[PDB]
Amino acid sequence: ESLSCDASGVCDGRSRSFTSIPSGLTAAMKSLDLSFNKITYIGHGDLRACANLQVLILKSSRINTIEGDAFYSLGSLEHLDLSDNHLSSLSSSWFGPLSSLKYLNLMGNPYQTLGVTSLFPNLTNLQTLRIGNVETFSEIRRIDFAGLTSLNELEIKALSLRNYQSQSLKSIRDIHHLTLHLSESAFLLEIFADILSSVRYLELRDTNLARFQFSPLPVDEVSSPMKKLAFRGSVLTDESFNELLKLLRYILELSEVEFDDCTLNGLGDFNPSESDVVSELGKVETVTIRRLHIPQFYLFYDLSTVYSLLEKVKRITVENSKVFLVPCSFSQHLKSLEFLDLSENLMVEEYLKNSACKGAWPSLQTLVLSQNHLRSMQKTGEILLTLKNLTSLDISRNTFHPMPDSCQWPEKMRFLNLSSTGIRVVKTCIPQTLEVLDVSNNNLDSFSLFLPRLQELYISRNKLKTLPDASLFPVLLVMKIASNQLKSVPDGIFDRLTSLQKIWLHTNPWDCSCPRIDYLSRWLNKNSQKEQGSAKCSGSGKPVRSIICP
Ligand SMILES: CCCCCCC/C=C\CCCCCC(=O)O[C@H](COC(=O)CCCCCC)CO[C@H]1O[C@H](CO)[C@@H](O)[C@H](O[C@@H]2O[C@H](C)[C@H](N)[C@H](O)[C@H]2NC(C)=O)[C@H]1O
Ligand SMILES: *[C@@H]1O[C@H](CO)[C@@H](O[C@@H]2O[C@H](CO)[C@@H](O)[C@H](O)[C@H]2NC(C)=O)[C@H](O)[C@H]1NC(C)=O
Numbered sequence: 001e002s003l004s005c006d007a008s009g010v011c012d013g014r015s016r017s018f019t020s021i022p023s024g025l026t027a028a029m030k031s032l033d034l035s036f037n038k039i040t041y042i043g044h045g046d047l048r049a050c051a052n053l054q055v056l057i058l059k060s061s062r063i064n065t066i067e068g069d070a071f072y073s074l075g076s077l078e079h080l081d082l083s084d085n086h087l088s089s090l091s092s093s094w095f096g097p098l099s100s101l102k103y104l105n106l107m108g109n110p111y112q113t114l115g116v117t118s119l120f121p122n123l124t125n126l127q128t129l130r131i132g133n134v135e136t137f138s139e140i141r142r143i144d145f146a147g148l149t150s151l152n153e154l155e156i157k158a159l160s161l162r163n164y165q166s167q168s169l170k171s172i173r174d175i176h177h178l179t180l181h182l183s184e185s186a187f188l189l190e191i192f193a194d195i196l197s198s199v200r201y202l203e204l205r206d207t208n209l210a211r212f213q214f215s216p217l218p219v220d221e222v223s224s225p226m227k228k229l230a231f232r233g234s235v236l237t238d239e240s241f242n243e244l245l246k247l248l249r250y251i252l253e254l255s256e257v258e259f260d261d262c263t264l265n266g267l268g269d270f271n272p273s274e275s276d277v278v279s280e281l282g283k284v285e286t287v288t289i290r291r292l293h294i295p296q297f298y299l300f301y302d303l304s305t306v307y308s309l310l311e312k313v314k315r316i317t318v319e320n321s322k323v324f325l326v327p328c329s330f331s332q333h334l335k336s337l338e339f340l341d342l343s344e345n346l347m348v349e350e351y352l353k354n355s356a357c358k359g360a361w362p363s364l365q366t367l368v369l370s371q372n373h374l375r376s377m378q379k380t381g382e383i384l385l386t387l388k389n390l391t392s393l394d395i396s397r398n399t400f401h402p403m404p405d406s407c408q409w410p411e412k413m414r415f416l417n418l419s420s421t422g423i424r425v426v427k428t429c430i431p432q433t434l435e436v437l438d439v440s441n442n443n444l445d446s447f448s449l450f451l452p453r454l455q456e457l458y459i460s461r462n463k464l465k466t467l468p469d470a471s472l473f474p475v476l477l478v479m480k481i482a483s484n485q486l487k488s489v490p491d492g493i494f495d496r497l498t499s500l501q502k503i504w505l506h507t508n509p510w511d512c513s514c515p516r517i518d519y520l521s522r523w524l525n526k527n528s529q530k531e532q533g534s535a536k537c538s539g540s541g542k543p544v545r546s547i548i549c550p
């Protein structure tokens with residue numbers, strides 16, 4: 001029914017049921033959000049009063065027509081969201097005065113094209129521009145981006161693209177993040193050609209790339225600034241994937257590639273060894289795959305090409321893609337790998353054993369097996385001994401059987417993550433070479449392991465009623481024990497932790513009074529730089545920083 005505006009000039013008119021921009025706008029309003037309304041029309045004078053407006057949010061109202069001079073007095077507007085409305089036609093007049101515009105969102109409107117007039121030439125301070133839609137935006141023309149030199153973000157949703165005019169994206173000098181929504185590989189070659197000098201991070205969404213083909217690009221040998229290339233919901237084939245890899249000859253500085261919810265169903269499988277791009281990841285050091293869907297491995301593949309292709313990569317992530325095995329042979333060829341993340345898969349000791357064979361992941365430093373199907377700490381550790389260079393292991397979120405007294409872990413292991421592992425007690429299975437141990441969110445009663453080199457302990461989210469003994473952590477820099485049900489700490493205890501720099505004590509039922517917690521209180525008070533978060537007293541949300549009894 002009405003506008004709710006604060007003393008900062010931030011006005012909120014969302015979700016009322018306005019059929020037009022309300023009246024009474026002032027010169028003191030800084031942000032006006034009239035989203036999710038029913039403003040079918042924006043006339044010449046509606047926004048004339050609020051000349052100091054910096055933010056105008058008008059998402060999902062039902063705007064279908066706006067007068068060319070509707071924003072004539074918004075010379076300080078920096079943010080304008082017209083997404084998800086009923087604009088069939090865009091008008092350059094809107095933007096003529098918005099010289100301060102940094103953000104503009106016209107995405108989600110049923111326009112077919114940007115119109116026969118460059119819309120953005122006066123937007124000299126523009127940083128984020130999102131345009132397009134799912135079903136009707138079908139053309140991108142050469143006049144479309146005239147005026148713009150550089151952008152942080154440029155998102156173009158054109159899942160219905162039917163015509164891309166060559167040279168359109170080429171006029172922009174610098175685009176840090178370009179997000180493209182393409183349903184087919186139809187104009188990929190030319191769009192790609194037009195951004196070789198400008199895009200540092202290209203992201204392609206929802207493209208069926210199964211019939212993509214490569215052919216040299218009629219361009220000049222120029223140094224491309226692309227560092228990251230990401231494919232979100234693509235459909236690939238073994239044959240098209242190889243066609244895509246040839247584009248790397250144009251992005252020599254590419255160093256990171258991502259594949260999210262992609263499908264890969266290579267049917268015919270390439271053959272011509274000459275038209276085969278191998279060992280061409282160039283300087284790609286990070287390969288990041290999430291939720292990949294392969295139909296079914298039934299026949300022997302080969303991987304000679306993949307061995308070569310992954311030969312110099314240092315970071316690989318294959319997350320939540322139902323992985324149950326990485327063949328030994330594969331692992332032995334990943335010679336430069338330092339980080340490997342198999343979070344959320346189906347690894348069990350039985351198959352890990354083959355995956356971590358003798359010459360497996362020779363340079364591996366960090367291994368993440370969070371959320372898999374591991375059940376035995378003793379076997380996991382034994383299998384991993386082959387990883388001579390391993391310094392950190394994350395086996396959190398695996399429900400392990402109670403650990404034994406004696407175990408064997410890689411010689412140089414300093415970081416061990418046993419968080420959300422379900423353990424009830426900790427035993428000398430955990431090695432003493434450890435500098436970092438996470439046993440948070442488990443079913444612990446106490447901790448009695450002497451770990452001489454422990455620099456950090458995470459024991460938060462457990463049932464410990466009393467702080468573990470301080471003689472167990474001579475060189476401890478960090479202790480986390482929030483959410484644990486501690487009522488008090490021994491007086492002067494922190495003098496005994498001669499290295500402590502950070503400690504988490506919040507979310508415990510501290511007992512505040514006069515004859516107790518006088519130490520904790522004062523210590524926390526004069527060590528605010530050390531306490532992370534804040535321990536509050538019980539029976540009173542008041543923090544444990546309350547002077548008591550003179
Ligand atoms: C830089 C260039 C790019 C470099 C990229 C490097 C990437 C390296 C890692 C890639 C991993 C991709 C595959 C992930 C995966 O885990 O794929 C499964 C098998 O994985 C392997 O065997 C190892 C292949 C290594 C290839 C290396 C290139 C498929 O399993 C399929 O075949 C299995 C029998 O073999 C079936 O049991 C399974 O059935 C499925 O099992 C499910 C667990 C569930 N029960 C389903 O219901 C079931 N399907 C049914 C029953 O219809 C089915 O999905
Ligand atoms: C040990 O592994 C756990 C489990 O994944 C990590 O905890 C997650 O941390 C991220 C970012 O800090 C959070 O978004 C999640 O909510 C956490 N999950 C859980 C278990 O609550 C934890 O950070 C790892 N420990 C260290 C020191 O790296």
Ligand SMILES: *[C@H]1O[C@H](CO)[C@@H](O)[C@H](O)[C@H]1NC(C)=O
Binds near residue numbers: 362363364388389
């Ligand atoms: C582990 O990694 C280092 C660094 O690449 C490598 O040089 C060394 O040979 C590896 N150690 C073993 C035993 O393979």
